[PDB]
Amino acid sequence: LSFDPAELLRTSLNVGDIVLLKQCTSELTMCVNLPQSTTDPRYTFAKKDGTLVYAMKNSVILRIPKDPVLTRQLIVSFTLATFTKFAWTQLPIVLKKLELIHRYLQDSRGSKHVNFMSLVRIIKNLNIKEATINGDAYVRKVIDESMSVNKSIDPTTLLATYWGVREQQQNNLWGSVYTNTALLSPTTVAVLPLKKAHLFYQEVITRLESNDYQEIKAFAKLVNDKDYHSIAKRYDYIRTLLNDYAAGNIEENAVLTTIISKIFRHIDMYRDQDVTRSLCGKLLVEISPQFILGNWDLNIPKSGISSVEQKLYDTAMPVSDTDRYDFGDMCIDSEDAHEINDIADPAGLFPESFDYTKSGISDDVLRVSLKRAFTTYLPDLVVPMLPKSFCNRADLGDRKTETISGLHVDYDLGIVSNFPKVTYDKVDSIKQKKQLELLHTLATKLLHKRIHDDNAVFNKCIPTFYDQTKSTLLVSEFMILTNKLCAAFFQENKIPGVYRCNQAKAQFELLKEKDITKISSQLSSSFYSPFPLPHKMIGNTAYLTVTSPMRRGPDLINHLQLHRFLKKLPLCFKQEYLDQYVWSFQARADILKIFQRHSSTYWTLKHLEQSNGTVNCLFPYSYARGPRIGDTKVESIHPLDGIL
Amino acid sequence: EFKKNLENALAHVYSTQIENSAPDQVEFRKVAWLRLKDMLYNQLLDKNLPAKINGYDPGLMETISPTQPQHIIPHLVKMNKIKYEQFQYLLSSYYDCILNQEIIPSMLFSNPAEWFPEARKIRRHIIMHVGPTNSGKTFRSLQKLKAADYYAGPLRLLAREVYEKFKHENVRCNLLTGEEVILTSGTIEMIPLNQNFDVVVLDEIQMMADLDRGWAWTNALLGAKAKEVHCCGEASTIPLIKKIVEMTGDKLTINEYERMGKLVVEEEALYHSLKKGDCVVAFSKKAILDLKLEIEKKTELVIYGSLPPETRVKQANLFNSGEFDILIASDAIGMGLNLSIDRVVFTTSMVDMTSSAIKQIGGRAGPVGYITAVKPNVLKAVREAINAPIEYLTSATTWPTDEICTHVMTTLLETIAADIEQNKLFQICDLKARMSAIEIITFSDKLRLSNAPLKDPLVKAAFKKFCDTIARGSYRPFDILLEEYEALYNIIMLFFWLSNRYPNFIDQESASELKNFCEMIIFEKIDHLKRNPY
RNA sequence: AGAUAC
């Protein structure tokens, strides 16, 4: 009655998969059918009652690997009812356990994410009687023993845990549950600080309901009398509340929303108007001087932990092995580019690179860097994965530069110093140049090879909009090549690494041979893995990313593995930690993807404001989405809400 | 260094000063303090063996974020950054972390409008069409409802009536009842509370104060995600709705309607003076109904609540023709069928009838209607009830939705309804029938079915067989060529309830034919009714 | 929603 999580990595959505759907969140369902046409790519699921449910793939909340609409099929009835009854029965105890370890895993300074599967593991492995003698150590012993490994998970506990977290989400004990789209499984969940989120909101609710919502009525009076100073000093907890709403931090607690409805309802100018995130924002500007950034999941500092860590990054300063190759007397980026990696050796800046004395990750900047799985790049702002000092030092830019740096492919720490001033545009434009021409032609040969031999292979305080060159063909092709070759080196040397991985199907393949919209609801997505898998978009070979060590954590880890290995030391990471780290990376990449698309939608729509039963549409404007699918004035637009 | 000792002194003192601020659970801070000091003393005292082993190790980032306070002192010693300020600050931070760890261990449903946050999150408008029966109150709202792009009725018959009228106007309106599925028209109990429409109509809104049925009207009123919510009913509903609209912030526009036609109570009635167009009202006391109708038939020249709908319609048409002259009704005449009744005759007045019920029955003679009693004492009691002012309802009855009491699970409702009581203008259901059905695995459906209908045990045995048929995850019932036919009809209908709820009971169309067989036979049995079970 | 640069 347990299953291995690796088969999620090893499999895609399939018949027999047991899932929870967003429509039918309160009951388990079973995948009974695949997408039926190019025209309609939705899935079919059967409930325990035998009723069908049709849903888009992204509606899957969690997934269990297997272990024409004939009404007669007990098979499903039996699986779903059995696991559901058991989870349901297991649940109240799970709620108590969740409350308790929330008390222990939570950090008062701020929001802190956890591998969700790990959480499930913890919930399974804890006995309440023992959890009360030699307690606190028993628990942290059950948390380390959580990590210890087999790796298998009970489905029932998984479901019960999910339900438990949502119910306690109503109390602001946990944050939103994030589900990875590739594996269609939950990756991570944030744990909100008890003092700041539970007690604070609870106090606010009592304060606001007190004396028949006296504080609310009095406030709406103040807003109506426009004496905002008193609001400022006396009622800043309400500004806090509206802000927390705007960030999408408390969007799911119904009570804070009814409370806020009463607040808006009592204020004259906004009276009788829709309760939206946008409205809380507009309302806030009308009261504060000079909102997506407020999101707790967006690890922005403004957040006490992100502020502590950024205080570390501000305050930080970094034995180069003579065993390094000298490249002697031998980079297409934007003008406004921050780190130039094209490969830099940030791993060298860490003691872990050479110190096999201490197991695991011991260094503070390294540990923080790994928590931020990537550099965070947004049109609004940038949060570099590495501190500024270290990026300034390690960036490759006439400078002594420490480094790691038909057709046939010849399978069989550095220093560099001559650096030419160049840009993507500059590269596109026109002896060294001849070398470059040879390179572009070579790149075209690489792409042609990948295409014909490997069966290899969407654009567009002041918002601006824009919409692939020879230069881009060049860089992308050589990056893909480098990463494949290093995949091969790691595999051949048996080095554990973080890897990157009907009529409708025929129509898709034909379309493969404009209107990529129709192909788009049949998409595969990337996922990180502790074991090698082909990246079937790029080719038929394993794919291991080493090209971006300063903005991607997995590359950085790959760099540490190379450093230890090349100097014939024991490797930094055994496969098991590789897996853990990989899970955290996937979580933070997904999270970033979500908030990136959120921010782009917000700004696009805000520009618009400044200027298959689905009723989905698109603009020419890529991120403005609101019978003949794929074929080619609205009422309302509220960007913060994502409403169009 | 004794200097450092003095530093720890003034530092800890400074911490006391920063631990004398608020009384709002200052005790936690106190305990944090004692644990602090104790941890220091213990540190140096136990250090007797690891004094230097302590004093060997420096710090880094933990100095800005006091990670592990399992050992403070050695770090304070070996501190070297590039003055006392470092000391006081660092220890203050440490204390804060101790408060993170110590203000954490072992230290520890009357707003139903809140149950519909999505509805509370939008402007909702209430239009109250208030008045007597026979006032035109329903038509303005129904016409507003058509031009839109849902109707909630109390009865399958009224839902049918609106369906029929809409179909005759060329407009595809589906039907959704407990038993029948064809804009949308339904019973109030079948209303979806998650489909953001544009207009909802709630008829007979005063049935919100039914002790047994009233939750659906309250729930629909509070929870319907509609731009306009039109409520039609009597004026006895107005103050609560204002109080209700007070809790939603929703604008309330009231529209008042008077009787379209006059009505009067006669002096004294003369049973031979019963007359064509007389309706003799016997309540659900079908034994009384049956006996009276057979007697009055046996001289010169029937609708009750437990009759099937088709039979009732046939009875109305027959009555509207001179193949039928008088009619006996029940309080089931209070609503439904559109009937041409000249004169109401009350058979009787075991509790007394409410003033409201008398008014509701009497207003169906709608332009001069007449009312009287069989017995003079009742005649005057009726004149009193009839002339009694608009009694106002004090409260609105409520029931937890599926979602909420599933959340409560986390006979539990004994407790839920008790704490619901333990707000002030909200009622708890009776649910005595529901608890009865609860006398009887899935839990969710057990709730979902605890609202299924039956009598007070043939209905109970059929229900058992149904629960058993649920546990395995339809015939035992023969008639060919009276109390038995009414019971069988109710079981075939119950079957229709589950089939409309669980298309995985299959009989369907063929079972519809079976229903008509119970109906014709009951009809013919009632027309030819030569005796009657009293 | 895939890929490189950031």
Residue numbers in the entry:
A (entry chain A): 90 to 156, 190 to 254, 257 to 273, 275 to 415, 421 to 432, 434 to 449, 452 to 463, 467 to 478, ...
B (entry chain B): 49 to 130, 147 to 172, 185 to 225, 228 to 260, 272 to 359, 363 to 393, 397 to 444, 452 to 468, ...
What does the paper say about this structure?
We obtained crystals for Dss170–900 D477N in complex with Suv343–685 in the presence of a dsRNA substrate with a 3′ 8 nt overhang (annealed 20Tx and 12Bx oligonucleotides) and ATP/Mg2+. The final model was refined at 3.55 Å resolution. The structures of Cg-Dss1 alone and in the Cg-mtEXO complex are very similar (RMSD of 0.77 Å over 533 C-α atoms); therefore, Dss1 does not change its conformation upon interactions with Suv3. In the Cg-mtEXO structure, Suv3 is positioned close to the small accessory domains of Dss1: β-barrel, HTH, WH, and S1 which decorate the catalytic RNB domain and form a funnel around the entry to the RNA-binding channel. Two main interfaces are formed between Cg-Suv3 and the small domains. The first and much more extensive interface involves the HTH domain of Cg-Dss1 (residues Tyr338, Thr383, Ser386, Arg390, Asp397, and Val400) and residues from the B-α-1′ helix of the first RecA domain of Cg-Suv3 and its vicinity (Asn187, Glu190, Lys197, and Arg199). The second smaller Suv3-Dss1 interface forms between the C-terminal domain of the Cg-Suv3 helicase and a long kinked α-helix of the WH domain of Cg-Dss1. This interaction involves hydrophobic patches that comprise residues Trp210 and Leu213 of Cg-Dss1 and Met523 and Phe574 of Cg-Suv3. Compared with human SUV3, this domain of Cg-Suv3 in the mtEXO complex has a different position relative to the rest of the structure. It is rotated by ~90° around a hinge between residues 172 and 185 and interacts with a cleft between the WH and HTH domains and RNB domain of Cg-Dss1. A 6 nt RNA fragment is present in the Cg-mtEXO structure inside the RNA-binding channel of Dss1 and it is superimposable with the RNA observed in Cg-Dss1 forming the same contacts with the protein.
The mtEXO complex is composed of two subunits: the nucleotide triphosphate (NTP)-dependent RNA helicase Suv3 and the 3′-to-5′ exoribonuclease Dss13. Dss1 individually has low RNase activity, and the robust nucleolytic activity of the entire degradosome complex nearly completely depends on ATP, an unprecedented feature that is not found in other known RNA-degrading systems. To understand the structure and mechanism of the yeast mitochondrial RNA degradosome, we present crystal structures of Dss1 nuclease and the mtEXO complex of the yeast Candida glabrata (Cg). Our structural analysis revealed the architecture of the Cg-mtEXO complex, in which the helicase motor feeds the 3′ end of the RNA into the catalytic channel of Dss1 for efficient and processive degradation.
